[PDB]
């Protein structure tokens, strides 16, 4: 289920990571490696993770992508994927994001969880996840594919760490029993007006199903979700482009709001 040589995995990881670190797009890597598999692509992603760890970055969480109809439709792919979150991705509520470090960024409204017990696949179900949730965190992702025109096939996107680049936490961060993640309403405002909205159920029917799916995907590589992991469960709505001068506010039903501005 692999077609890359080890040398190619290491070199592709450097190439793709450099596009992020040096703020430029690249061609879809499947153009040069058309036989590349998902296992190849995740090898590349985890090697990028290793590069970041080796230079001292902490990995502060994981994200699930392409979990909602809206995001599947927008990106043309219907296969859920995951990627990792590095510490310097983090942005404080109300913070300023420097777009000069970004290529062609978009924002997504999500709900995140922090776990308090390990989760393992395979065969992880919704009922296995519930007690492992410590609390929930309103989170806006900034995604920024390193591929030109934000156009990819899923294998390329996995290799590019599922387009991850920034995330903004905010609002009220409460216990799971206090928050219905299925019916949680989310309203995205940009420059003072509503531009997107949705409910948590858009994420695979229930955001906690995304957590179960992540455990199952990780198990394919012998990995799991350690206790204390921050997980972004997926874009509830279509992603919206942002640019210098923009301000955004995402309102979470009963949980306040997350805001940011861009320069
Ligand atoms: O859309 C992309 O470029 C991939 C990132 C997907 C994602 O983070 C989400 O659906 O929440
Ligand atoms: Mg996302």
Q: Quick check: CB of 238 below 6 Å from ligand 1? A: no
Q: Find the helix or strand (DSSP H, E) in which 241 lies.
A: strand 240-241
141 is in an annotated binding site: yes
Q: Which of 200, 258, 216 is nearest to 68 (CA)?
A: 200
Experimental method: X-ray
Q: Which of 141, 150, 133 is nearest to 109 (CA)?
A: 141
**162 alpha carbon – ligand 1 mean position (Å):** 6
- Between CA 169 and CA 193, with CA 244 as vertex, the angle to 5 degrees is 65
**23 alpha carbon – ligand 2 mean position (Å):** 19
CA pair distance 182, 104, nearest whole angstrom: 31
Q: Quick check: CB of 66 below 6 Å from ligand 1? A: yes
Q: Are 248 and 259 in contact (CB under 8 A)?
A: yes
Q: Find the helix or strand (DSSP H, E) in which 126 lies.
A: helix 126-129
> Which residues does 130 contact at the CB level (< 8 Å), separation at least 6?
176, 208
Nearest ligand to the CA of 198 is 1
CA pair distance 248, 110, nearest whole angstrom: 14
**172 alpha carbon – ligand 1 mean position (Å):** 24
CA pair distance 108, 85, nearest whole angstrom: 15
Token pair of 145 as six digits: 């594919």
The number of residues making up the chain comes to 263
Token pair of 125 as six digits: 């179900």
CA pair distance 59, 146, nearest whole angstrom: 20
Q: Find the helix or strand (DSSP H, E) in which 9 lies.
A: helix 6-21
Q: Quick check: CB of 210 below 6 Å from ligand 1? A: no
Q: Are 65 and 83 in contact (CB under 8 A)?
A: yes
Nearest ligand to the CA of 147 is 1
Cα of first residue to Cα of last residue in the chain, in angstroms, is 43
Give helix 6-21 / helix 38-54 axis angle, nearest 10°: 60
223 is in an annotated binding site: no
Domains, the chain, with CATH or none: 1-263 (3.90.850.10)
Q: Quick check: CB of 75 below 6 Å from ligand 1? A: yes
Q: Are 136 and 243 in contact (CB under 8 A)?
A: no
63 is in an annotated binding site: yes
CB burial class (10 A; 0-12, 13-18, 19+) of residue 51? middle
Q: Which of 90, 64, 67, 236 is nearest to 158 (CA)?
A: 64
**Burial profile 127-141: b = 16 or more Cβ within 10 angstroms, e = fewer:** ebbeebbbbbbbbbb
Q: Which of 212, 22, 202 is nearest to 124 (CA)?
A: 212
Q: Are 263 and 99 in contact (CB under 8 A)?
A: yes
In units of Å, what resolution does this entry have? 1.6
């Amino acid at each position: 289920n692999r077609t890359l040589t080890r040398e190619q995995v290491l070199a592709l990881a450097e190439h793709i990571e450099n596009a992020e670190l040096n703020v430029h797009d690249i061609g879809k890597v499947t153009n040069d490696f058309p036989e590349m598999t998902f296992a190849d692509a995740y090898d590349v992603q985890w090697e990028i993770r290793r590069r970041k760890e080796a230079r001292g970055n902490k990995i502060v969480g994981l994200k699930m992508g392409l979990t909602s109809w809206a995001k599947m439709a927008q990106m043309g792919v219907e296969t859920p994927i995951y990627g990792f979150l590095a510490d310097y991705f983090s942005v404080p509520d109300g913070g300023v994001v420097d777009c000069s470090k970004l290529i062609h960024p978009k924002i997504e409204a999500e709900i995140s969880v922090v776990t308090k017990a390990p989760l393992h696949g395979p065969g992880c179900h919704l009922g296995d996840v519930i007690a492992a949730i410590d609390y929930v965190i309103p989170t806006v992702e900034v995604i920024d594919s390193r591929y030109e025109n934000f156009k990819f096939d899923p294998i390329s996107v996995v290799a590019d760490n599922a387009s991850s680049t920034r995330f903004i936490t905010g609002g009220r961060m409460a216990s799971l029993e206090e928050v219905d993640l299925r019916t949680l309403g989310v309203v995205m405002e940009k420059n003072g007006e509503v531009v997107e909205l949705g409910a948590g159920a858009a994420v695979l029917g229930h955001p906690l199903s995304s957590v179960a799916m992540l455990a199952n995907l990780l198990a394919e590589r012998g990995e799991h979700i350690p206790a204390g992991t921050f997980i972004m469960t997926g874009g509830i709505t279509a992603a919206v482009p942002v640019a210098p001068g923009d301000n955004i506010t995402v309102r979470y039903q009963g949980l306040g709001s997350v805001s940011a501005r861009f320069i």
